[PDB]
C-alpha cells in the first residue's frame, strides 16, 4: 500500500524577551516518530516510536543541528513577515510548515509537499511539479520572487525526491512490525431516553489503535444519515482511541437499529445492537 | 530525516 512521511513544524514568536518557540514533529504513515522542542531542558530531536532506536548518536546529533538551523530560519522568516504585513512589534505570530512525500508500494514518489502557513492561513506552497510556487497573498509574492531568484525549488525538489523517499524506506523497514500493530475496538450500545417518546442510541468503540475507524448506524438494511451525531475520534491517553456515533429513534423500535464498526484490527466488522 | 530549508521568507 502507499506510505507517507511528514515533518510538521511550528515557530511561534513571543512578545517578551524569549525567542520563538520552535517545534518539529516527524510522522511515518501518520504515526509520530521524532520530535524536537526548543522549550525542552535539553533541546534535541528525540525518538517517539520504539523502532527509531536503530539510529546511532550521529543521527540524533546531526538532526539536532539541523533543527537548530531551522529554528534560526524560522526566526528570520517571522521577522521578515512581520515587516511584509506591517504588524506591531509586541505581538505573537505563528509560522508553520508541512513537508514530505507519499510513496507507492513500488517506492515511486507519488507526490512531494512543501508548504507554509502564517497566522493559520496558507502562505506559500511548492506546486506538484516541484518547480513552481503558489503564493496566497501580497506578502507571499515577495517570498515567491525571492525563492524564484535564488533557485529554492531545486533544493526542495532534491530533498523530496531523494532523502525524503530514501529515509522513509529505511524507516518502514526498521518500523515494519511495530507499524502493523493494531488493537481492536470493543463496542457496545447504550440507550438514553429523551423527550417526546424518542431515545438516543449511542454506539461506542473503545480501546482501538490506530485511530482510523468508521461507525455506521442502520435500519432495515439501510445506512442512516439524519438524526445522527458523531464525535471526533479522541485519545484515551494510554495510546488507544475512542469514538461514538448516535442516532435518535422512536421508543419501542430501538432493537431494529444496528451499529457497524469498521476497523483494520478486526477480523471482520462488528455488528451490534442495543441488548437490554 | 527532516528538510533543511534554504532561503528565508
Amino acid at each position: 500500500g502507499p506510505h507517507s512521511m511528514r515533518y510538521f513544524e511550528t515557530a511561534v514568536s513571543r512578545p517578551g524577551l524569549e525567542e520563538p518557540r520552535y517545534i518539529s514533529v516527524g510522522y511515518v504513515d501518520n504515526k509520530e516518530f521524532v520530535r524536537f522542542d526548543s522549550d525542552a531542558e535539553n533541546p534535541r530531536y528525540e525518538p517517539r516510536a520504539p523502532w527509531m532506536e536503530q539510529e546511532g548518536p550521529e543521527y540524533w546529533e546531526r538532526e539536532t543541528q539541523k533543527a537548530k538551523g531551522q529554528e534560526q530560519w524560522f526566526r528570520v522568516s517571522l521577522r521578515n513577515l512581520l515587516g511584509y504585513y506591517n504588524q506591531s512589534a509586541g505581538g505573537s505570530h505563528t509560522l508553520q510548515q508541512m513537508s514530505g512525500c507519499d510513496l507507492g508500494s513500488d517506492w515511486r514518489l507519488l507526490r512531494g509537499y512543501l508548504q507554509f502557513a502564517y497566522e493559520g492561513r496558507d502562505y506559500i506552497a511548492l506546486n506538484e511539479d516541484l518547480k513552481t510556487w503558489t503564493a496566497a497573498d501580497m506578502a507571499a509574492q515577495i517570498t515567491r520572487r525571492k525563492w524564484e531568484q535564488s533557485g529554492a525549488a531545486e533544493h526542495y525538489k532534491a530533498y523530496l525526491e531523494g532523502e525524503c523517499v530514501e529515509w522513509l524506506h529505511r524507516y518502514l523497514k526498521n518500523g515494519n512490525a511495530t507499524l502493523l500493530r493494531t488493537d481492536s475496538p470493543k463496542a457496545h450500545v447504550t440507550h438514553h431516553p429523551r423527550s417526546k417518546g424518542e431515545v438516543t442510541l449511542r454506539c461506542w468503540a473503545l480501546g482501538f489503535y490506530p485511530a482510523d475507524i468508521t461507525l455506521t448506524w442502520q435500519l432495515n438494511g439501510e445506512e442512516l444519515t439524519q438524526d445522527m451525531e458523531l464525535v471526533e475520534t479522541r485519545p484515551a491517553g494510554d495510546g488507544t482511541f475512542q469514538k461514538w456515533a448516535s442516532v435518535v429513534v422512536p421508543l419501542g423500535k430501538e432493537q431494529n437499529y444496528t451499529c457497524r464498526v469498521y476497523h483494520e484490527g478486526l477480523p471482520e466488522p462488528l455488528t451490534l445492537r442495543w441488548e437490554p | 530525516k527532516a528538510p533543511a530549508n534554504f532561503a528565508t521568507m
Partner: T-cell receptor
Amino acid sequence: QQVRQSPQSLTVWEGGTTVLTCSYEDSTFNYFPWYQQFPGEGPALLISILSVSDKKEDGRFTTFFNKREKKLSLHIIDSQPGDSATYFCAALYGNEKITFGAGTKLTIKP
Amino acid sequence: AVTQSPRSKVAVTGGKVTLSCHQTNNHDYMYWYRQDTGHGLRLIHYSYVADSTEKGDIPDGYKASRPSQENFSLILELASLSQTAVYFCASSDAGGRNTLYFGAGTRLSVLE
C-alpha cells in the same frame, strides 16, 4: 579534514581545458559550491551543484559530481588569462556549515 | 555589499587590533575567516543574530562583536606574530546552503 583540494597551484596553457578536482570524506554531503577568488578581492560564488545531479554548466564553466568516488571537479574550457584566480571547492550537508578546501591557485599563461 | 575596514593593518606584537565589517544585505549571519598565503578559508567566529556571537573553528586569540545587524568586528586584544594573515568578512541570509557574500579582505601584519 573533510574536503581535500590539490594541487596548491596549477598552470594551464591559454585555450586549454583546466581540470580542478577535490575529494571529500563525508558521503552524506549533498551541496557542493565552488568559489573563485581573484587577487586582492574576496571569494565569490562561481557555480554549485546538488548531489542529485551529475553536472552543472554555465558558459565555459562546468562542475561534475561523482558520488561513487566522492570526487567533485571543475572544468574550464578555452581557459583565459582572466580565469587566473584561486578556486575553492566546498561541501556541506543540509544546513550545516560550509567546509572549504584549501584552494587551488590557477594561472593561465600564453 | 559587504565592506571591510581597514584594507590593511600593521600592528605591534601585543597591540590591540579591531577589524570591522559592514554589510548592507540585511543578512542575519556574519562570519570572519582567516586565509594564509592565499590558502584556506578558516572560520574564526560567526554570529546569527544582531547583538550575539558564536565561536567558530579557530576562535583562539580572537574576540568578535555584533553590535547591530549590519556590523561584525574581529578583535585581537594582544596581537601575536602568528596572527599575520588575510581576514575575510562574509554575510549570508540564513546559513547552511545560502550563498556567502564576502568582503574584499584585510591584510594584517604583526611586527615586533
